[PDB]
């Protein structure tokens, strides 16, 4: 029933789940910018002056 | 860049966490560990008490009561040995015990 002590621990190892690199290599995804407001096609003078 | 063959061989080697300091001078100090009777229900797999006989004080270490640490339940503890001529880091299951000196009631 001894349970005698031993020497000092001569190193530690830490094991953990590493993140994947292939999800880390993707280029960005910007939101596509909505265009600046354009002149709607088919505009003409609908008003002729009276008389 | 050294390597080591991971040879898992299986018993639970105890590890001690003294609430006083580091045990830096080992001497005549008797260590005995205690296990619950009823191995039927699954609580016996965690019920274990380690006792430390010194002439001055007696140190006791639990796994269940208030003050039993949470490092060996939210994380596993292993022990590497690394038989250097063979080069195999053979691994044992282990537990850490936070010992606290017993006084009175």
Curated annotation (Swiss-Prot), chain A:
Q: Where in the cell is it found?
A: Nucleus, Nucleolus; Chromosome
Q: Which organism is it from?
A: Homo sapiens
Q: Which residues carry this modification: Phosphoserine?
A: 26, 34
Q: What's this protein's name?
A: DNA-directed RNA polymerase I subunit RPA34
Instruction: State the similarity comment.
Output: Belongs to the eukaryotic RPA34 RNA polymerase subunit family.
Protein role: Component of RNA polymerase I (Pol I), a DNA-dependent RNA polymerase which synthesizes ribosomal RNA precursors using the four ribonucleoside triphosphates as substrates. Involved in UBTF-activated transcription, presumably at a step following PIC formation.
Q: What is the lineage of its organism?
A: Eukaryota, Metazoa, Chordata, Craniata, Vertebrata
Oligomer and partners: Component of the RNA polymerase I (Pol I) complex consisting of 13 subunits: a ten-subunit catalytic core composed of POLR1A/RPA1, POLR1B/RPA2, POLR1C/RPAC1, POLR1D/RPAC2, POLR1H/RPA12, POLR2E/RPABC1, POLR2F/RPABC2, POLR2H/RPABC3, POLR2K/RPABC4 and POLR2L/RPABC5; a mobile stalk subunit POLR1F/RPA43 protruding from the core and additional subunits homologous to general transcription factors POLR1E/RPA49 and POLR1G/RPA34. Forms a heterodimer with POLR1E/RPA49. Part of Pol I pre-initiation complex (PIC), in which Pol I core assembles with RRN3 and promoter-bound UTBF and SL1/TIF-IB complex.
Give the misc comment: It is in an antisense orientation to and overlaps the gene of the DNA repair enzyme ERCC1. This gene overlap is conserved in mouse, suggesting an important biological function.
Q: Where is this region: Disordered?
A: 18-41
Composition bias (Pro residues) maps to: 29-41
Q: What range of the parent protein does this fragment cover?
A: 103 to 153 of 510
From Swiss-Prot, chain B:
The GO terms this record gives for MF are: DNA binding; RNA polymerase I general transcription initiation factor binding
Task: Write down any Gene Ontology CC term.
Answer: fibrillar center
Location in the cell reads: Nucleus, Nucleolus
* Keywords associated with the record: Acetylation, DNA-directed RNA polymerase, Nucleus, Phosphoprotein, Transcription
| Predominant subcellular localization, coarse grouping | nucleus
Superkingdom of this protein's organism: Eukaryota
Q: How is it modified after translation?
A: In normal conditions, deacetylated by SIRT7, promoting the association of RNA polymerase I with the rDNA promoter region and coding region. In response to stress, SIRT7 is released from nucleoli leading to hyperacetylation of POLR1E/PAF53 and decreased association of RNA polymerase I with the rDNA promoter region.
Which residue positions does Phosphoserine occur at? 25
| BP GO annotations | nucleolar large rRNA transcription by RNA polymerase I; RNA polymerase I preinitiation complex assembly; transcription elongation by RNA polymerase I; transcription initiation at RNA polymerase I promoter
The entry sums up its family as follows: Belongs to the eukaryotic RPA49/POLR1E RNA polymerase subunit family.
What quaternary structure, including any partners, is listed in this protein's UniProt entry?
Component of the RNA polymerase I (Pol I) complex consisting of 13 subunits: a ten-subunit catalytic core composed of POLR1A/RPA1, POLR1B/RPA2, POLR1C/RPAC1, POLR1D/RPAC2, POLR1H/RPA12, POLR2E/RPABC1, POLR2F/RPABC2, POLR2H/RPABC3, POLR2K/RPABC4 and POLR2L/RPABC5; a mobile stalk subunit POLR1F/RPA43 protruding from the core and additional subunits homologous to general transcription factors POLR1E/RPA49 and POLR1G/RPA34. Forms a heterodimer with POLR1G/RPA34. Interacts with POLR1G. Also binds UBTF/UBF. Interacts with PWP1.
As for what it does, the entry says: Component of RNA polymerase I (Pol I), a DNA-dependent RNA polymerase which synthesizes ribosomal RNA precursors using the four ribonucleoside triphosphates as substrates. Appears to be involved in the formation of the initiation complex at the promoter by mediating the interaction between Pol I and UBTF/UBF.
Q: What is this protein called?
A: DNA-directed RNA polymerase I subunit RPA49
- Upper taxonomic lineage: Eukaryota, Metazoa, Chordata, Craniata, Vertebrata
Q: Which gene encodes it?
A: POLR1E
């Amino acid at each position: 029933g001894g349970l005698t002590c031993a020497s000092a621990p001569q190193g530690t190892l830490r094991i953990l789940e590493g993140p994947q690199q292939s999800l880390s290599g993707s280029p960005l995804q910007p939101i596509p910018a909505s265009p600046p407001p354009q002149i709607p096609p088919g505009l003409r003078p609908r008003f002729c002056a009276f008389g | 860049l050294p390597s080591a063959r991971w040879q898992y061989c299986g018993q639970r080697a105890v590890l001690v966490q003294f609430s006083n300091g580091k045990l830096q001078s080992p001497g005549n100090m008797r260590f005995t560990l205690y296990e619950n009777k009823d191995s039927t229900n699954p609580r016996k797999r965690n019920q274990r008490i380690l006792a430390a006989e010194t002439d001055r004080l007696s140190y006791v270490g639990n796994n269940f009561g208030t003050g039993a640490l949470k490092c060996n339940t939210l994380c596993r503890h292993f022990v590497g040995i690394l038989n250097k001529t063979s080069g195999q880091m053979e691994v044992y299951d282990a537990e850490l015990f936070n010992m606290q000196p017993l006084f009175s009631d």
